[PDB]
């Protein structure tokens, strides 16, 4: 339906490689000990950051929209806040990899209606092979994100030389209590590092979100550990599609996501990159000076093309967070379909708190 990208070039060589893109869900930055949250919510990622020099933690990445399907239309394609409809007239990150000769895979624990024409389904079909692990009635069903590990191990065993693996997690999405098993509520009844003025209902919701962060860390670190245990050639990118306000912002009474009434904790996302030893040897690259760049998830496809070593008509290396030519632009938020409703993310208040900006 769409024409391939013009003047397409692959400069990464022709050796076999496996590239992984982990799409997290609702995980905000300010609630992870990896970014300064005083509760130990991400211990396995913390230790991995201490002992592994190839894990690169990005500290100033925010999303553009706080709703799953509305952000993925921008993150996975050339669309952004100024041109939101480019997911219909330009190729996607999955089309680009197939044009590069990759056998693409889509693994997911989010309920996907394969008989229905949702936009997530259309994205997941653009791959060669799909693994839907959460076919299921609905809310309360209890399908945890470790469902992806066994098929992830199976895709690693596929003998295709060039592989792109996309792992879509339920992450830390509502309802928080159903993201982790019942006997792993480490923060149940805990009241330390809790904002003031919470009732028993708001307190249990707050602690369930940190319990869900704990489990999410286990899943992301396990994907990195299993990938590393295959001694591969390639890298892995983890990002959350958007954040989630959970009584973080004063007066500590708000929970959820609202584009028309935005707070920072809804837009701050983790952004991790793990490069294999073989890939770093063949593509030496220093990322230590990039970790503090102010970056929007809306331009993710340019960072990916850069890392994958791809160039084409439309490739903008100034919007790649790992490129030497990176130039900071305005990190737009707000509904791109309303009349002049775009505002700078930096104008939002409470940027000084730990894990914001
Ligand atoms: Na985009
Ligand atoms: Zn989402």
UniProtKB/Swiss-Prot annotation:
It is a multi-pass membrane protein. The keyword Cell membrane applies. Pathway: Bacterial outer membrane biogenesis; LPS core biosynthesis. Keywords: Cell inner membrane, Cell membrane, Lipid biosynthesis, Lipid metabolism, Lipopolysaccharide biosynthesis, Membrane, Transferase, Transmembrane, Transmembrane helix. Its main location: membrane. It is an enzyme of class 2 (transferase). One of its GO terms (cellular component) is plasma membrane. One of its GO terms (biological process) is lipopolysaccharide core region biosynthetic process. One of its GO terms (molecular function) is phosphotransferase activity, phosphate group as acceptor. Its EC number is 2.7.-.-. It is found in: Cell inner membrane. Belongs to the phosphoethanolamine transferase family. EptC/CptA subfamily. Catalyzes the addition of a phosphoethanolamine moiety to the outer membrane lipopolysaccharide core. Forms a complex with an unidentified protein of approximately 36 kDa. This is Phosphoethanolamine transferase EptC. It comes from Escherichia coli (strain K12). The lineage of its organism: Bacteria, Pseudomonadati, Pseudomonadota, Gammaproteobacteria, Enterobacterales. The gene is eptC. The chain holds residues 221 to 577 of 577 of the full protein.
């Amino acid at each position: 339906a769409l024409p391939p990208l013009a003047n397409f070039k692959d400069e990464s060589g022709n050796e076999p490689r496996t590239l992984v893109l982990v799409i997290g869900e609702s995980t905000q930055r300010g609630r992870m000990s990896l970014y300064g949250y005083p509760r130990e919510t991400t211990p396995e990622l913390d230790a991995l950051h201490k002992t592994d020099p190839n894990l690169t933690v990005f500290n100033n990445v925010v999303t553009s929209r706080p709703y799953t399907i509305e952000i993925l239309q921008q993150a996975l394609t050339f669309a952004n806040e100024k041109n939101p409809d480019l997911y219909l007239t330009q190729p996607s990150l999955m089309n680009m990899m197939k044009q590069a000769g990759y056998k693409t895979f889509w693994i997911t624990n989010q309920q996907t209606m394969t008989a229905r024409n949702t936009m997530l389904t259309v994205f997941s079909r653009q791959t060669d092979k799909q693994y839907y692990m959460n076919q299921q009635r609905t809310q309360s069903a209890r399908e945890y994100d470790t469902n992806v590990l066994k098929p992830f191990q199976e895709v690693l065993n596929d003998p295709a030389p060039k592989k792109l693996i996309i792992v879509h997690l339920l992450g830390t999405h509502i309802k928080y209590k159903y993201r982790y098993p019942e006997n792993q509520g480490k923060f149940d009844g805990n009241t330390d590092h809790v904002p003031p003025g919470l009732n028993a209902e708001e307190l249990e919701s707050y602690n369930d979100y940190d319990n869900a962060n704990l489990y999410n860390d286990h899943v992301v670190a396990s994907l990195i550990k299993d990938f590393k245990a295959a001694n591969p050639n390639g890298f892995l990118v983890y990002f959350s599609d958007h954040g989630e306000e959970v009584y973080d912002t004063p007066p500590h009474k708000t929970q959820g996501r609202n584009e028309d009434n935005p707070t920072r904790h809804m837009y701050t996302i983790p952004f991790l990159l793990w490069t294999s030893e073989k890939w770093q040897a063949t593509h030496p690259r220093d990322f230590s000076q990039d970790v503090d760049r102010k970056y929007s998830l809306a331009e993710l496809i340019h960072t990916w093309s850069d890392l994958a070593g791809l160039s084409y008509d439309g490739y903008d290396p100034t919007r790649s967070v790992v490129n030497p030519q990176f130039k900071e632009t305005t990190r737009w938020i707000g509904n791109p379909y309303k009349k002049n409703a775009l505002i700078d993310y930096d104008t939002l208040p409470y940027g000084d708190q730990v894990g914001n900006q």
